[PDB]
C-alpha cells in the first residue's frame, strides 16, 4: 500500500467506523435492554495518530472503541 494512499485510506476507514458507531447510537437511543438484559451504553470511537515508529505523524487509527 503506497504511503499517502495508506494515510488517506486509514482516514477513510476511521471516519467510516466513527459514522457506524454514531448510527448505532442514534438508532439505539430509547433501547430498554440489551440481549442479556443491561442498559445499552452509548458507544464512542477513539482516534490515535498512526505510524508509531517514524515521523510522529501520518494516518489515523481508530483502535479501542
Amino acid at each position: 500500500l503506497l504511503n499517502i494512499f495508506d494515510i488517506a485510506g486509514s482516514a477513510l476507514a476511521a471516519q467510516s467506523k466513527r459514522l457506524n458507531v454514531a448510527a448505532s447510537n442514534l438508532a439505539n437511543a430509547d433501547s430498554v435492554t440489551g440481549p442479556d438484559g443491561q442498559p445499552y451504553r452509548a458507544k464512542q470511537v477513539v482516534f490515535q495518530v498512526d505510524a508509531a515508529p517514524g515521523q510522529a505523524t501520518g494516518g489515523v487509527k481508530v483502535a479501542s472503541v
Partner: protein
C-alpha cells in the same frame, strides 16, 4: 426466548396484532318506563314478551 432466571431479563418476543372489528350490537332488553296515553286501544307490557 427462554428466561434463564440467571438475570432479570425482558420476555421479549414480538407480536403486532391488528384491527378492532365490531363483533356485536347487543340489545339491552330491560323494562322501559310507562307513559299514560289514555287511549283505550293502547297497551304496554310488564315483564317479558312480544306481540306477534
Amino acid at each position: 426466548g427462554a428466561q434463564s432466571s440467571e438475570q432479570t431479563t425482558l420476555p421479549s418476543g414480538l407480536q403486532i396484532g391488528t384491527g378492532v372489528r365490531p363483533v356485536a350490537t347487543e340489545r339491552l332488553h330491560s323494562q322501559g318506563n310507562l307513559s299514560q296515553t289514555n287511549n283505550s286501544k293502547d297497551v304496554a307490557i310488564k315483564g317479558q314478551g312480544f306481540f306477534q
